[PDB]
Structure 1
Amino acid sequence: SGLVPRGSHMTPDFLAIKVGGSLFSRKDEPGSLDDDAVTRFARNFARLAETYRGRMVLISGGGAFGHGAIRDHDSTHAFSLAGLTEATFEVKKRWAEKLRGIGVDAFPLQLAAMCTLRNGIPQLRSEVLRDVLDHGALPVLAGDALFDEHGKLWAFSSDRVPEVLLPMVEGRLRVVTLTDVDGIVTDDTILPEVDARSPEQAYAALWGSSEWDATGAMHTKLDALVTCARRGAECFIMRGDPGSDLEFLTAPFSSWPAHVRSTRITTT
């Protein structure tokens, strides 16, 4: 409804943290979950969750489950994808279950029950997300199989979940996507800043996976964050490490500790 001050000096009002599947699950290993990694990440997320109570969502990568359930679905019945919803709910559960164990009010929410696709733009269609946050709880979210306006299912990566927050979050949204690289690498060298109004050089730098990636690797990652940033968010691609202290993610970007490697995406 109003003028929002934004800048490297300002403190974010909302944290959307997305953790890559690959950081806790081996894609090509059915059912796999590094519990040690989950435990230790969960412990760092929980400290953030207490600071940002009702002002945070944790978004989980699909790992073996999500990439698995897309791999296997028959392409000739769009509806076989429905397995993906059951698959990514499994990962939300693991996080919530773990986070509650160390005192976080973590509640898993099924995105497919809350959000549809309407001309390719994901539409929040449930008031429950806003309510859970208002209650001071921590929504644990993930990618999903989403219905479009014609009833066809589409695989929707956890990377794009933050886009769903855009029309909902008042004030400063920060999106941090924890990944298995330090940021977008160009040339042996990571790009520190990307202007979301002209991300040309960032898109120019991406390479193709070894064919193993159902949700578009870095390209979908950049699409999502470029989309959020054009809508005001401060967005980051950085390496997730299960033991890494993340308290600085509550801090103005100006006052971030030394030698943190990231790619930041903003609409100057």
Structure 2
Amino acid sequence: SGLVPRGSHMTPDFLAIKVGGSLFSRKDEPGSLDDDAVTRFARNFARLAETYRGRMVLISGGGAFFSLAGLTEATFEVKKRWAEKLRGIGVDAFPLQLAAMCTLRNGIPQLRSEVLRDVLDHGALPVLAGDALFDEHGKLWAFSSDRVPEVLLPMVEGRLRVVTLTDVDGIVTDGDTILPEVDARSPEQAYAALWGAMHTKLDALVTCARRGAECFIMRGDPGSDLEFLTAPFSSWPAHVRSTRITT
């Protein structure tokens, strides 16, 4: 309910990192992950998981969509692949089926967060992903991985940082240039820049920013060190590109 100190000079209290499916899945084989990419990412996420032990979730994109029962199985498989890889390197990773613990009411996800808190409360790493969710009149919908950070909003106290890793440096305006900053209260310019994919990321991150989260769209790379994600924005290395979305 209360006043949370926020700013570019403050350390985040919780990290939700979303890795886009385009970064670890082969076009050259649809349905197929690139094990090298998953392995190298996993190593960089493990470092973050150890610093943010009990204060981080990993959200995977990817996994091919009542025929949406298939979707829940496809996204479970992706969670399993990340969780397995992470555990192979010493990280206590537990995959959770969002469909079993979250429904939609008037379009807003309602997480029954007891298990998620349990995994966190005792210092493990929840591995999440998009899913098929039921709503209040009992219908099933496809809920994108990009929107999964929204589920954390009621639960996370303090400063939530959401990072969505994708295959572009940020929101580009045309093209010549990226938008370094978006005010979630008036994000017209950002929507106007889009050519849906990036639209879904933007809606999701504006929603989270309205509830106080510091959000980023930036480029992921399996090899890239991500430790700066634990640090105040003001202390980030020079020449990191991102679109930062805050209120």
Q: Output the TM-score relative to the length of structure 1.
A: 0.89
SS of structure 2 residue aligned to 1:15: strand
Structure 2: how far apart are the matches of 1:145 and 1:63?
12
**Aligned counterpart for 2:227 among listed residues 241, 244, 247:** 247
Q: Secondary structure at the match of 2:225?
A: coil
Q: Is the 8 A contact 1:29 1:64 kept in 2?
A: no
Q: Deviations over 1:80-139 (max 9, x none)?
A: 111100010000000000000000000000000110011111111241111110010000
Deviations 1:188-239 (A, max 9, x none): 200000000010000001107xxxxxxxx10000000000000000000000
Alpha-carbon distance change, 180 to 126 in structure 1, aligned in 2, over 3 angstroms: same
- Name the SS of the counterpart of 1:63 in structure 2: coil
Whole-angstrom distance in 1 between the partners of 2:234 and 2:111: 33
RMSD: 1.2
Distance in 2 (CA, whole Å) between partners of 1:125 and 1:250 is 27
The Cα of 1:30 is off from its aligned counterpart by 3.2
CA distance in 1, matches of 2:190, 2:100: 34
- Partner Cα distance (1:186, 1:22) in 2: 21
Distance 1:85 1:197 in 2: 34
CA contact (8 A) 2:113 2:155 kept: no
Aligned residue number for residue 165 of structure 2: 178
| Identity over aligned pairs, percent | 100
User: Could you say what secondary structure the match of 1:227 adopts?
Assistant: helix
What SS does the aligned partner of 1:243 have? coil
Match of 1:192 among 180, 186, 203: 180
Q: Secondary structure at the match of 1:245?
A: coil
Q: In 1, distance between residues paired with 2:113 and 2:59? A: 17
Deviation at 1:28, TM superposition (A): 7.4
Structure 1 position 31, deviation (Å): 2.4
Give the SS at the match of 1:123. strand
Distance 1:193 1:227 in 2: 15
> Residue in 2 aligned with 1:221?
201
Which 5+ residue runs of structure 2 have no aligned equivalent?
none
Assess if the C-alpha contact under 8 Å between 2:101 and 2:111 holds in 1: yes
Return the offset for 1:62: 1.5
Structure 1 residues without counterparts, runs of 5 or longer: 66-78, 209-216
- The count of aligned residue pairs is 246
Shift of residue 64 of structure 1?
4.9
Deviation at 1:151, TM superposition (A): 1.7
Moved more, 151-160 or 239-248: 151-160
Equivalent position SS for 1:170: coil
Q: 1:12 to 1:201 in 2, by over 3 A?
A: same
* Bigger Cα displacement from structure 2, 25-34 vs 36-45: 25-34
- The answer on whether the counterparts of 1:27 and 1:63 sit within 8 Å (CA) in structure 2 is no
Q: Please, which moves more after superposition, 149-158 or 243-252?
A: 149-158
Which portions of structure 1, spanning 4 or more consecutive aligned residues, are displaced by more than 6 angstroms? Answer: none
CA contact (8 A) 1:194 1:202 kept: yes
